[PDB]
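Fold this complex.
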Amino acid sequence: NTVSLPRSCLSTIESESSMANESNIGDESTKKNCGPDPYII
Amino acid sequence: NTVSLPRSCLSTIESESSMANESNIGDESTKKNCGPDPYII
Amino acid sequence: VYTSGKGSSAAGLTASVQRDPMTREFYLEGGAMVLADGGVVCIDEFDKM
Amino acid sequence: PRTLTAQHLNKLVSVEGIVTKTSLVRPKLIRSVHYAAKTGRFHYRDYTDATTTLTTRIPTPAIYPTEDTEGNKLTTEYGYSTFIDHQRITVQEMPEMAPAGQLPRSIDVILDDDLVDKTKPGDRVNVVGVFKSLGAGGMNQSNSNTLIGFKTLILGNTVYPLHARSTGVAARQMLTDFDIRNINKLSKKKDIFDILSQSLA
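Structure:
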């Protein structure tokens, strides 16, 4: 009201919840990386 | 018989078929990028 | 619309059909006779056309 | 097409105009079927894209399979696969309604399967569908360019040809039993030719 969609997922910097910290890791040692330009409209 | 899993998807360099060229693009202008370390065992 | 026979400079006297420069399709290019629909058309030198 | 704006997006509309150009009717691959010689088994895969559903979905770009899960080669079975017809058309503002001296406006309509060849260029048509946007208007990645916007079109579901004067679409009227009775009755009189003649103009 040049806006662009975020380059990275915003669920890491945004510490939404305590269980959100759990949800951002799983299946042993592998880190969570959504990728480049993960958002859709 | 240090081997590592491929860093990139191998479906592009491997020109498997003529329809495989079609399958590697879709939904308008967006390019196809599988991401880093896309393979699982 | 006030015009003569043979129309005006770069303006015809009757409906003209032309193709769109970019889309390459039909539209009414002009023409005093349709431009003045619902009004009056003033023709001078009616004997030359 | 002139009075269709960005405030009608995602809503069901009905547009009128003139067909200007159609497209070649092409098949679209939906399900492929294959065969393995070393095992004697048949496999298959499904494919989808963004225009086959009204709601947005997460893409699943599956590849065309040439091998088996065990490395064996595959053979395509063109007779057992599935293809669907596809066409794209353009609709413009009617010549008898557009303002004089002004360049016209038009909109694209996409049709599928059983509505694929229901009109020809030059017809007066009425199309009812959903006015929808697609993709990202240069938002993903940097895409410094700002001139382009969001691609938009109509996912049609109803196409109606309309009859006009001095056009190639013929008029037809549905005949009811009352009409048939009255016609077959009037057929039995003796001055029928005279009555029908005196009615003209």
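Chain B is about 15% helix and 0% strand.
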